[PDB]
Design an enzyme around this catalytic site. Structure first.
Site, PDB file in Angstrom:
ATOM      1  N   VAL A  20       0.849  -1.215   0.000  1.00  0.00           N
ATOM      2  CA  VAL A  20       0.000   0.000   0.000  1.00  0.00           C
ATOM      3  C   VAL A  20       0.874   1.252   0.000  1.00  0.00           C
ATOM      4  CG1 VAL A  20      -1.921   1.245   1.064  1.00  0.00           C
ATOM      5  CG2 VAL A  20      -1.659  -1.192   1.485  1.00  0.00           C
ATOM      6  N   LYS A  35      -3.161   0.261  -3.589  1.00  0.00           N
ATOM      7  CA  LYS A  35      -2.751  -1.115  -3.346  1.00  0.00           C
ATOM      8  C   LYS A  35      -2.298  -1.794  -4.631  1.00  0.00           C
ATOM      9  CE  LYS A  35      -5.262  -2.692   0.711  1.00  0.00           C
ATOM     10  NZ  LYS A  35      -5.260  -4.033   1.358  1.00  0.00           N
ATOM     11  N   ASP A 122     -12.983  -9.897   8.046  1.00  0.00           N
ATOM     12  CA  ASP A 122     -11.672  -9.655   8.637  1.00  0.00           C
ATOM     13  C   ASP A 122     -11.561  -8.271   9.259  1.00  0.00           C
ATOM     14  OD1 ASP A 122      -9.108 -10.461   9.399  1.00  0.00           O
ATOM     15  OD2 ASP A 122      -8.207  -9.591   7.606  1.00  0.00           O
ATOM     16  N   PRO A 125      -8.750  -3.557  14.202  1.00  0.00           N
ATOM     17  CA  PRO A 125      -8.481  -2.124  14.421  1.00  0.00           C
ATOM     18  C   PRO A 125      -7.635  -1.442  13.322  1.00  0.00           C
ATOM     19  CG  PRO A 125      -8.348  -3.290  16.502  1.00  0.00           C
ATOM     20  CD  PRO A 125      -8.553  -4.336  15.442  1.00  0.00           C
TER      21      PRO A 125
HETATM   22  C1  LIG Z   1      -3.374  -3.965   6.318  1.00  0.00           C
HETATM   23  S1  LIG Z   1      -2.670  -3.613   4.701  1.00  0.00           S
HETATM   24  O1  LIG Z   1      -1.343  -4.101   4.559  1.00  0.00           O
HETATM   25  O2  LIG Z   1      -3.595  -3.867   3.646  1.00  0.00           O
HETATM   26  C2  LIG Z   1      -2.548  -1.843   4.708  1.00  0.00           C
HETATM   27  C3  LIG Z   1      -1.323  -1.194   4.865  1.00  0.00           C
HETATM   28  C4  LIG Z   1      -1.247   0.200   4.848  1.00  0.00           C
HETATM   29  C5  LIG Z   1      -2.379   0.959   4.639  1.00  0.00           C
HETATM   30  C6  LIG Z   1      -3.613   0.326   4.465  1.00  0.00           C
HETATM   31  C7  LIG Z   1      -4.976   0.803   4.227  1.00  0.00           C
HETATM   32  C8  LIG Z   1      -5.315   2.236   4.100  1.00  0.00           C
HETATM   33  N1  LIG Z   1      -4.616   3.085   4.834  1.00  0.00           N
HETATM   34  C9  LIG Z   1      -4.850   4.394   4.831  1.00  0.00           C
HETATM   35  N2  LIG Z   1      -4.114   5.229   5.620  1.00  0.00           N
HETATM   36  C10 LIG Z   1      -3.082   4.715   6.521  1.00  0.00           C
HETATM   37  C11 LIG Z   1      -2.215   5.924   6.896  1.00  0.00           C
HETATM   38  C12 LIG Z   1      -1.147   5.482   7.879  1.00  0.00           C
HETATM   39  C13 LIG Z   1      -1.843   5.021   9.165  1.00  0.00           C
HETATM   40  N3  LIG Z   1      -2.738   3.893   8.871  1.00  0.00           N
HETATM   41  C14 LIG Z   1      -3.745   4.142   7.800  1.00  0.00           C
HETATM   42  N4  LIG Z   1      -5.763   4.920   4.037  1.00  0.00           N
HETATM   43  C15 LIG Z   1      -6.451   4.159   3.240  1.00  0.00           C
HETATM   44  C16 LIG Z   1      -6.296   2.776   3.230  1.00  0.00           C
HETATM   45  C17 LIG Z   1      -7.142   1.957   2.291  1.00  0.00           C
HETATM   46  F1  LIG Z   1      -8.088   1.171   2.957  1.00  0.00           F
HETATM   47  F2  LIG Z   1      -7.848   2.796   1.486  1.00  0.00           F
HETATM   48  F3  LIG Z   1      -6.373   1.117   1.504  1.00  0.00           F
HETATM   49  C18 LIG Z   1      -5.755  -0.301   4.157  1.00  0.00           C
HETATM   50  N5  LIG Z   1      -5.004  -1.409   4.310  1.00  0.00           N
HETATM   51  C19 LIG Z   1      -3.700  -1.079   4.502  1.00  0.00           C
END
Ligand SMILES: CS(=O)(=O)c1cccc2c(-c3nc(N[C@H]4CCCNC4)ncc3C(F)(F)F)c[nH]c12
Length: 278
Positions: A20, A35, A122, A125
């Site tokens: 991401v 992603k 799934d 937090p």
């Molecule tokens: C669990 S993973 O490895 O899939 C994964 C990794 C990194 C970010 C994401 C996000 C995400 N994160 C943000 N912001 C981050 C900013 C940094 C503090 N955590 C939130 N904004 C939009 C998303 C969106 F859902 F749209 F993909 C969803 N899954 C993620």
């Protein structure tokens, strides 16, 4: 190609699926989460269906880009997630009015999803995203080390066919964690996860969960732990909150409270929408 239209800002994380990035859309100027998934026609359709599942408490899927043995998902960007916010509020605790607001919004999101027979599968937090406006949003809709802490017992016991109840279970586990500042069931293996559940909620039997002893991974040799009082589990949550939480953690998926019915629970009679300090 298609990806030349996105200027990478930074890598924000990495998952089972893929990487991401925070990114900028060069034509719209939009800041997005991008992603990259490494590679199926069924995923292309099932993911494209998520493009229409639009709600204020669901992270907005802006674009699905299938190009060159790669699938890119372009999402709304939010600055914070609930795991990080929980960690940053460890000394003090998330104020109850905000816990309540967050729980309420997440149940609205689930209600909407579940009305369209879409399960998340799934909730955790880390994939619950928050903004400065008081909003919280469901992200990373799962399709059908990976954390087990929020997994419903029917999944752990080998149910192949999940109901929407699995999401309610997970959200209950998250609710308790927001209240107590410690994970409710922090298992580090499927059996540890199942036995942590049993040690708190009682080893289930046919009385509490009709059918449980026929489940694919149910073993008669499971130890028989007695249930603990919920007043022990989530102090100092009030009686409304404990009543709601207990209904969200019913063993039997068919007895477990629905999102729609949870929204009518008296716990939410005084719900507000506070703004957090991020
Ligand atoms: C669990 S993973 O490895 O899939 C994964 C990794 C990194 C970010 C994401 C996000 C995400 N994160 C943000 N912001 C981050 C900013 C940094 C503090 N955590 C939130 N904004 C939009 C998303 C969106 F859902 F749209 F993909 C969803 N899954 C993620």
């Amino acid at each position: 190609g298609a990806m030349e239209n996105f200027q990478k800002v930074e890598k924000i994380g990495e998952g089972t699926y893929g990487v991401v990035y925070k990114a900028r859309n060069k034509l719209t100027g939009e800041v997005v989460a991008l992603k990259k998934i490494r590679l199926p026609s069924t995923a292309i359709r099932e993911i494209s269906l998520l493009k229409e599942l639009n709600h204020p408490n669901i992270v907005k899927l802006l674009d699905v880009i299938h190009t060159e043995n790669k699938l890119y998902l372009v999402f709304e960007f939010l600055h914070q997630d609930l795991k990080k916010f929980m960690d940053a509020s460890a000394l003090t605790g998330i104020p109850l009015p905000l816990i309540k607001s967050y729980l309420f919004q997440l149940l609205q999101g689930l209600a909407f999803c579940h009305s369209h027979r879409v399960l998340h599968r799934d909730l955790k937090p880390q994939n619950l995203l928050i903004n400065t406006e008081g909003a919280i949003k469901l992200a990373d809709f799962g399709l059908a080390v990976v954390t087990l802490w929020y997994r419903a017992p029917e999944i752990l016991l080998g149910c192949k066919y999940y109901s929407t109840a699995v999401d309610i279970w997970s959200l209950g586990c998250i609710f308790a964690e927001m209240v107590t500042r410690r994970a409710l069931f922090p298992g580090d293996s499927e059996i540890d996860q199942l036995f942590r559940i049993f040690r708190t909620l009682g080893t289930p039997d046919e009385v509490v969960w009709p059918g449980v002893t026929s489940m694919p991974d149910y073993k008669p040799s499971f130890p028989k732990w007695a249930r603990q009082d919920f007043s022990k589990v989530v102090p100092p949550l009030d009686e409304d909150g404990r009543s709601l939480l207990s209904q969200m953690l019913h063993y039997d998926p068919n007895k477990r409270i629905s999102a729609k019915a949870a929204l009518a629970h008296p716990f939410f009679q005084d719900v507000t929408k506070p703004v957090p300090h991020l």
